[PDB]
Ligand binder design. Structure first.
Ligand code: HDD
Ligand code: HDD
Lengths: 727, 727, 309, 83, 84
């Protein structure tokens, strides 16, 4: 055979290339020289293909992989066809149970490294030296939808990091918001059932916009804080690279002296914080349900590695009760104004998996998986999580040997007296399978706790109280965090929150549920409550108007670190610009455009009304990446329309629609020369409008203005104008 | 802690040692220099223990593995103890479904080598060159009992060989009898359910002596042939090393020219044929239910490797219909007087597993696993077996990735487009997961059939007929093979057959089922039927007395290869002798005894009334292996009582009974000097009797005479003398 | 064809009979008049058979259950034989994992009744009224051996009772000795691995007489008390009917006023205490490995109902 | 077998036939039906061979495949007619 | 505390039950291949009762040492010297 093109254009270059320049490929084929201990340790299970014979799983070479064995060429299939049955059997049992929650997720390999030794506060080996590099495997996800659901839904996002340390696996299993919806793990199934697709008909997918979710929320005010984050633009991240990461729970750091420090974990996106806008997000679920997964994969293939800074919020054991909220309450955040995040290290995601199923689908992350130098706390949510993540992979991963599945395997030594279990891979040669034993001289042996390489010993926390199924009275406050969050948002962010609640409650069929949720909003903020209420045709009562707002959180009336956009931090490297072509493009414009974009690491997609190519005025042949309908503006960060034969595209509905959609969604638009005639379609004044770059040609100044707008992400001042544009 | 004894007696020497001298141990530790390609390939999953820290499965060192974490040293266990939960979770899910049949089995590693190239008749790579060594993994089994059932039951024995070839796994899945009970795979569940423990109460275990088995047998005369084999001494082998092995079905050998030759597979025991007697076997299921498993393991540790000769019954395509019976009928054997077994190669079993569960319990054998050069036939039992063995491991071994379990893995390459499935180990890098493809240039690729290393192509057998659920009329003859078997047995073998049937039928509660089986036996042979009938207090009718016997099998009225003992093949190496010690043994006898046994590779066990030591007449200190009750005569092949202070054990009931039991079970007994006083225990006349060695001392010909008796296995002339004797 | 004898001697009389008098049979056929709420509640899943057509699991009548479908009567079996594949598939997947411990067990149905109300010390509904009957299902077992191992081995015996009460299931999961070998559950896998068949070769079955168990015992003196009981004749009971039952642990009884009372549970065999002797027990594992299972079943069929206080 | 956990998936409510189903198959993970048949095999005399085979007939008969004519060699080959 | 209950149990058995206990330990320990393990168990029996320890030791051909012969029996269980 020889089906590959003789030119060799079926195989992607094994060099970093921008999004869409090459066909994407398995990580080790795309970047074979990107290495880490974990990645190298997976080499024993990696399987090639080129130059090998096609075989059964038993190693028997197949002569004909096109036909079943039958009596005569139009006869009955025979039961003796073992080649067929093995192929079909494997196919028939390919699927494993998806994750109960966070079933939809995207993952990649990377490495972590500390900025300095943290031996003074923790004896955790991976944090003991800036030169200790710890391989990681990070899986990002949504919560509600199945594995086949869409990425840009409105939802909380999971952020799990598997650290392959030299003293064991440490899984930091977090999310993109600093709190969770509920306080006690016992209500998790109630919350999840409430948000998941309703039981009779299994609708709706990937959405909290339905009766049962809001019913539960209305009856459980502890959920309001995380509900606020979800209704904000935090619920619709632009990309996994541009969202924050949090551990949520107060854990402990244990140093060598055996002193405990309370800690909350943080992931700071070095690419900055950025989110889509609701209409763009929702339409993106239909145009490209794999948008986040694609974006992550393509950023890593282009060398735009997602980078996060690990940060710790540290609270002395003696300060436990110094806040007006309980440190162990997962529905409560620790304002960065009160307890600053200490920048501890950096994680770089630099390599995609080879096989999604094998590495991503099969990975098992669990918050219980800690290492010496780390310890839990009594947070009632975290406490109950500890039972679950081991339990769940008995079905999901088929048994108790899930740690032998390659991606889950520790890179450090593991030895114990545990044996058997379905699909046992390890063959134990130990004469003994119990301890204490004399027949193997008691090996493997226990190790006393110590400064380094010691066994795990729990912090000896004093436990005093009666066996009671009771919520701590201290956790009984539900509106102050929500209010703090609300007051810390910019005016447009507040407006998107109001719109989030209004859109969702509009889809709640039982009107009394909408009213009860508006009543909860009145205990948080009158302005929020009135604005949502007015969109629902609901009138606040006398009493609702008089509810006194909750108290500030330890004197804070706001905290700018809770806003996505209050404090500038945008990064354009890795963003993408759509360039709308015409049949005789002014080649000088493009040249300048592309040069400026490449200098800032911004990608471009050349779009036209058909595939193939167009020729610029000087004979420059320009390859078309996609059509206007084929790669909608939802997929880009800004739109540029170069000068040339504008009449070729000026009556192109799709071309005009491309600009109106981008406009509606507050994206920077740049118009050069006669591309300025497209101003009429988005009704832009003759004199101009902030957010629309326009010039006689696309020069250095023009590119500087566009790149400046892209660093600010979206044109928030345009909001009050998109109302009157039909798109 | 440091619990092994200073002196290192906890650890067995890593060199061949006779049974009972050292603690048995994992194969890789007992014989580290015994290697093969498969054993070396398992090194990636072998795990050590010594000098390693005790950890969780995630690599975290454990400080205290004696206690659960609790609130107070007498307080409640906390949910956060993940070390406790992981260790209990693995324990809680250790078991996997046992095999539906053959659940009880003992396995070992070894190697195979052909004597000469078989290229003229088969293109199978493992038979193409005498210098080609093929690693094997053999599992011997019983059929009916569960994994924890006993070894020396009356049953058929399984004999499965996994040939790790260069062109794929070849599994030869046979038994210790040349036929099976049924003709068509559709009745397998019927037959098995009938023989297994009855469904209301799950009784009995490891036995066909119950109503449902004999009910089925009486209604399905096709089973009579294999029933005859089971009722004979063949059903209670002395050990796996001393039984024959057969593939049962007629398969095909395909050469490079495309010529098909019919073949039946045979295994000849190089240690010979040898079985126990019913009373010993049944009692031995009580005194040591692991007798076969232990004997196999210890033979390999002593260096007495089980050796088998692969042999082929070869029948040209033109002779398919030249016999009285159908070649495709699995209830019919091919008499060696008609078609000789041609010696093909030697299999040597020379290493035990490291971990029984990982290697033995998870091994999956399947007769559909063939390689180019072999093919199937239309044998209706075999046809259906091809469906079952892949199917069953979806539950037994948790999925379709069972070939990725270390023991099952091919040693040769395996590449295909199958993906995912529970427990997926292999991480595929192939850009394509389908064929035909151009994106990976169609790799891996199909390979045409050819003389060597070519793809599998089935032999183009002509198929002609209507789609029918119909037994071929050529299969409808049920008594001629049973009769041929009967007539080929010695008189004492025939008595033992009569005794097996009589005993089994006595456990059948409904008398009419006993009568119906007696009626079937009368269709086979009158003498046989009459003798069984007599033992059951049943009178044959005149009609039954004149049933004309089935015809000879192609003129044969007997075939001595069908007997275990008609044609001598006695091997004494690996056998064991019990030595009844006293407190002042004549050391000269002992030296003569022990050295004669060692010269022929016959083992000995020194027994006494307690453990510890005994001092011979010259001060030689004798180590006691076991007490008379601790290692009953059932476990040895012969008994020797050396001269000394005989009055020390003369009135010891156990010692006396030891000789009564061995005498009854027809084992050679040797009495030196005053040990001849024991003759009155077994009723031996002054002049002596064949089967009893006796002299003034253990000198001269005493040991050569005893060893000749051992070579003939049992004293069959003593049968009439055992009738009375209360033992 | 193959039918019952003319005399109807294929079927056991549906009345109490002495061991050996009639072939044993499923409980609802042997004693149709013996009922209790649990037994009646199982009627939705009980399936008869007499007078019904043989079918696939999809309810399709089978014409020929003697043969596979093939192209010609000496031809290859065809893949479209769904009757055959359904039948084989079900057979191929009959086994389920046996219990990690106590895999070998024998069970029966019964009923419990308190002698008097125990409301002063406990508000448990099943102990509140002398005339309120609670259906039970009891499973007796050995500890070490597989489900196919022998009954009369030397081992501890499990004595599990499932109480179907009006306020929930109560499982009293005990043993025939009043203590266990170890103190903390974290060591369970160590103890069980030590007594179970050794890992390299999986020997010995249903026996503690091997190096690893005695090694563990020798380094863990807390096991000595239950080891004493195991080595005594308590380790080889004559029948499940003639052994004591104990819950081992101290639990609590809680009354309606909130008072907690510490309790240890006992079962007293009304047939008395009786054990075999070692030689007998060992030989019996060979002569009848199903002796305790058989003896329990036959006692019940005979009207000699196992009774415990 | 993997999707619905075993060979008793016909006992899952929605999959249950509404007509009678009786056979000699037993056990399997999550076995719902409790068989009282003394026999779990056929032929059997202990339950007088019930449940019994049923000859094919016009109505309520056993399934019998159409006796189609088969003739050709054992081949892995696409029919030329499909090309 | 590991020996008082073992001893309470031992003293509560009849003479023939005590012998059967002895025979059980002796049988079992005879199947233990590593002799040091048998000796360690006998040592543990000497912490329970010397009559018992000595009867097992004799069947195993083991000699109790002088220190073993001088191990003080465990205390009675709340004054009980037996419980029938
Ligand atoms: C009581 C149980 C429970 C509770 C209270 C939580 N979840 Fe959880 N979560 C699970 C039980 C669980 C699970 C059922 O065990 C899962 C799903 C599948 C799995 O492997 O683990 C899991 C998965 C899972 C994952 C996906 C890991 C991966 O990508 O595979 C993330 C990121 C989180 N959860 C994070 C959270 C956050 C940050 C929580 C609150 C702080 C939360 N979980 C509470
Ligand atoms: C159609 C069903 C079928 C039929 C008719 C047979 N069996 Fe089979 N056999 C089974 C279905 C099966 C099985 C259910 O698939 C088993 C259970 C466990 C497994 O892996 O394979 C098995 C296992 C099994 C093994 C044990 C493999 C091991 O040690 O793991 C032996 C040696 C054989 N059988 C031998 C045979 C021979 C000689 C038989 C007749 C020629 C036969 N079986 C008929």
């Amino acid at each position: 055979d020889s089906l590959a093109p003789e030119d060799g254009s079926h195989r992607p270059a094994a060099e970093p290339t921008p999004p869409g320049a090459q066909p994407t490929a398995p990580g080790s084929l795309k970047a074979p020289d990107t290495r880490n201990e974990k990645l190298n340790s997976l080499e024993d299970v990696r399987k090639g293909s080129e130059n090998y014979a096609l075989t059964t799983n038993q190693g028997v070479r197949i002569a004909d992989d096109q036909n079943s064995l039958r009596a005569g060429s139009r006869g009955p299939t025979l039961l003796e066809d073992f080649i067929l049955r093995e192929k079909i059997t494997h196919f028939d049992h390919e699927r494993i149970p998806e994750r109960i929650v966070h079933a939809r997720g995207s993952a990649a390999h990377g490495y972590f490294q500390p900025y300095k030794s943290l031996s003074d506060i923790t004896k955790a080996d991976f944090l003991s030296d800036p030169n200790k590099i710890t391989p990681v495997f990070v899986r990002f996800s949504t919560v509600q939808g199945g594995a086949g659901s869409a990425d840009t839904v409105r939802d909380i996002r999971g952020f799990a990091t598997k650290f392959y340390t030299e003293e064991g696996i440490f899984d930091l299993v977090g999310a993109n918001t600093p709190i969770f919806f509920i306080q006690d793990a016992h209500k998790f199934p109630d919350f999840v059932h409430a948000v998941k697709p309703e039981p009779h008909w299994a609708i709706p997918q990937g959405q909290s916009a339905h009766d049962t979710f809001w019913d539960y929320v209305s009856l459980q005010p502890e959920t309001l804080h995380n509900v606020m984050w979800a209704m904000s633009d935090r619920g619709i991240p632009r990309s996994y690279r541009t969202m924050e990461g949090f551990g949520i729970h107060t854990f402990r750091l244990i140093n060598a002296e055996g002193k405990a420090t309370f800690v909350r974990f943080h992931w700071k996106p070095l690419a900055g914080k950025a989110s889509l806008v609701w209409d763009e997000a929702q339409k993106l679920t239909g145009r490209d349900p794999d948008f986040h997964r694609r974006e992550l994969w393509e950023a890593i293939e282009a060398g735009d590695f997602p980078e996060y800074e690990l940060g710790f919020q540290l609270i002395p054991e003696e300060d436990e009760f110094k806040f007006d909220f309980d440190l162990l309450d997962p529905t409560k955040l620790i304002p960065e104004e009160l307890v600053p995040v200490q920048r501890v290290g950096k994680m770089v995601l630099n390599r995609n998996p080879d096989n999604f199923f094998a590495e991503n689908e099969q990975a098992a992350f669990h918050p219980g998986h800690i290492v010496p130098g780390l310890d839990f706390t009594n947070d009632p949510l975290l406490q109950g999580r500890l039972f679950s993540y081991t339990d769940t992979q008995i079905s999901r991963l088929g048994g108790p040997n899930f740690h032998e599945i390659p991606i889950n395997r520790p890179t450090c030594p593991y030895h114990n007296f545990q044996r058997d279990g379905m699909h046992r891979m390890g063959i134990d040669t130990n004469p003994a399978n119990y301890e204490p034993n004399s027949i193997n001289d008691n090996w493997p042996r226990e190790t006393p706790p110590g400064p380094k390489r010691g066994g795990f010993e729990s912090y000896q926390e004093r436990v005093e109280g009666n066996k009671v199924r009771e919520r701590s009275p201290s956790f009984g406050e539900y509106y102050s965090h929500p209010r703090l969050f609300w007051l810390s948002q910019t005016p447009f962010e507040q407006r998107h929150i109001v719109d989030g609640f209004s859109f969702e409650l509009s889809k709640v069929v039982r009107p009394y549920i909408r009213e009860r949720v508006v009543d909860q909003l009145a205990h948080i903020d009158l302005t929020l409550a009135q604005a949502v209420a007015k969109n629902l045709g609901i009138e606040l009562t006398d009493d609702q108007l008089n509810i006194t707002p909750p108290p500030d959180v330890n004197g804070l009336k706001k905290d700018p670190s809770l806003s996505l956009y209050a404090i500038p931090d945008g990064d354009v490297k890795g963003r993408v610009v759509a360039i709308l072509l015409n049949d005789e493009v002014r080649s000088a414009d493009l040249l300048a455009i592309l040069k400026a974009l490449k200098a800032k690491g911004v990608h471009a997609k050349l779009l036209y009304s058909r595939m193939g190519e167009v020729t610029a005025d000087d004979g420059t042949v320009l390859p078309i990446a996609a059509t206007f309908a084929g790669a909608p503006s939802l997929t880009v960060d800004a739109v540029i329309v170069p000068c040339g034969n504008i009449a070729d595209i000026a009556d192109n509905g799709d071309a005009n629609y491309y600009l109106m959609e981008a406009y509606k969604h507050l994206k920077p638009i740049a118009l050069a020369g006669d591309a300025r005639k497209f101003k009429a379609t988005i009704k832009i004044a003759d004199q101009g409008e902030e957010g629309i770059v326009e010039a006689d040609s696309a020069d250095g100044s023009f590119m500087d203005e566009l790149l400046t707008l892209m660093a600010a992400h979206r044109v928030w001042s345009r909001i009050p104008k998109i109302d009157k544009i039909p798109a």
